[PDB]
Amino acid sequence: SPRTRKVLKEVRVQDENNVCFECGAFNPQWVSVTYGIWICLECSGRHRGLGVHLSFVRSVWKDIELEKMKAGGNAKFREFLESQEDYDPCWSLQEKYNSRAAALFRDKVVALAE
Amino acid sequence: SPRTRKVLKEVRVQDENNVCFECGAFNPQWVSVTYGIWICLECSGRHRGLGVHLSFVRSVTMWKDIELEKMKAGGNAKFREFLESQEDYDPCWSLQEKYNSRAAALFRDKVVALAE
Ligand SMILES: [Zn+2]
Ligand SMILES: [Zn+2]
């Protein structure tokens, strides 16, 4: 976990990766590797109820998992979701992560990490 | 319903009363008297669910003087405008959060006071 600490710092110190993606709490301590997003203790609990096929929730490790972190990001995922036509800013967590948009970014994050 | 029909259609014409307050569907036949708002058949059933302390529902076809005065005092756009300008407004409120909000309370009372 040393070699890998350094990398997460690079990624954390980047695009809105130090606020929780869902609720904006500072210094998110958790991630959804799936979307390269950084979340807080509480929101990780909530993510854990979505299913691993929709969200893979870790605490700040496999190489391909770091590559997903480099590939995705808080700002990047939000920017992406905001341009989809059936985007709804009032989605529940469930609707959001079960949406076309989310699936597409997952696929994107995998394709890039590979 | 002849006096009614007239005034009711006079009110339909006022801002945004031709679409459902909640979901936006065309030509809502139902109302929540509590807010002067117009709502579709489906959403009317939804409003019966909140409880008559949060939403009193009636039909365009189903009226009292006061019930009618409340329609004049509220309105879909008026209520939305009011809501958007309260400090705690959340446009992603669920139906229960919305109608249990302070903003909803305050608009109920604007409507009652204007009515009488
Ligand atoms: Zn959070
Ligand atoms: Zn409706």
Side-chain angles (χ1 to χ4, degrees), chain A residues 2 4 7-8 11 16-40 42-69 71-77 80-114, chain B residues 2 4 7-8 11-13 16-40 42-57 63-80 82-87 89-116:
Chain A
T4 62
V7 168
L8 297 174
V11 184
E16 300 168 3
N17 279 344
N18 200 35
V19 303
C20 166
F21 176 75
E22 309 293 354
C23 85
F26 296 127
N27 204 18
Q29 284 300 299
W30 300 82
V31 302
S32 190
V33 166
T34 322
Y35 309 96
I37 72 192
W38 299 71
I39 47 174
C40 73
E42 202 209 81
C43 294
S44 76
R46 302 184 68 210
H47 264 255
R48 282 193 182 287
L50 298 164
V52 63
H53 66 290
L54 297 177
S55 186
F56 184 84
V57 173
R58 289 307 102 181
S59 178
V60 184
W61 274 94
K62 307 190 158 179
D63 310 65
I64 191 58
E65 289 160 14
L66 287 178
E67 286 299 340
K68 294 190 182 180
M69 294 297 311
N74 279 343
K76 191 171 180 174
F77 184 41
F80 174 83
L81 287 167
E82 290 188 33
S83 58
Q84 311 303 129
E85 84 151 79
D86 286 312
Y87 166 69
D88 193 325
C90 297
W91 272 335
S92 60
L93 217 67
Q94 221 197 307
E95 287 166 305
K96 185 180 196 183
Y97 287 100
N98 283 284
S99 69
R100 278 208 92 240
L104 276 166
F105 193 82
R106 285 206 286 293
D107 181 91
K108 182 169 159 171
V109 164
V110 172
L112 275 170
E114 285 146 29
Chain B
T4 314
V7 156
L8 275 191
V11 180
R12 267 194 265 211
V13 176
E16 275 155 40
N17 284 338
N18 67 175
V19 296
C20 181
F21 185 71
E22 302 304 351
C23 69
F26 297 128
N27 201 6
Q29 299 306 283
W30 296 85
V31 299
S32 175
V33 180
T34 311
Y35 308 98
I37 63 170
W38 304 60
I39 62 183
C40 65
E42 155 152 32
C43 298
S44 77
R46 292 268 289 280
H47 274 257
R48 296 256 187 213
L50 292 160
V52 72
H53 77 296
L54 285 186
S55 201
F56 184 67
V57 182
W63 277 70
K64 278 194 195 286
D65 304 283
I66 199 59
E67 292 172 73
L68 292 168
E69 293 296 332
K70 283 166 172 271
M71 297 303 296
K72 291 195 169 169
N76 282 0
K78 183 176 186 166
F79 184 35
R80 185 187 45 80
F82 188 79
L83 285 182
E84 289 176 1
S85 74
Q86 307 303 304
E87 197 196 348
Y89 182 63
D90 183 341
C92 297
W93 266 328
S94 52
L95 207 67
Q96 281 192 247
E97 288 168 336
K98 189 187 230 166
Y99 289 105
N100 284 304
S101 73
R102 180 170 176 92
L106 280 171
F107 196 78
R108 290 204 273 288
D109 311 9
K110 179 167 139 188
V111 168
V112 167
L114 281 184
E116 76 216 46

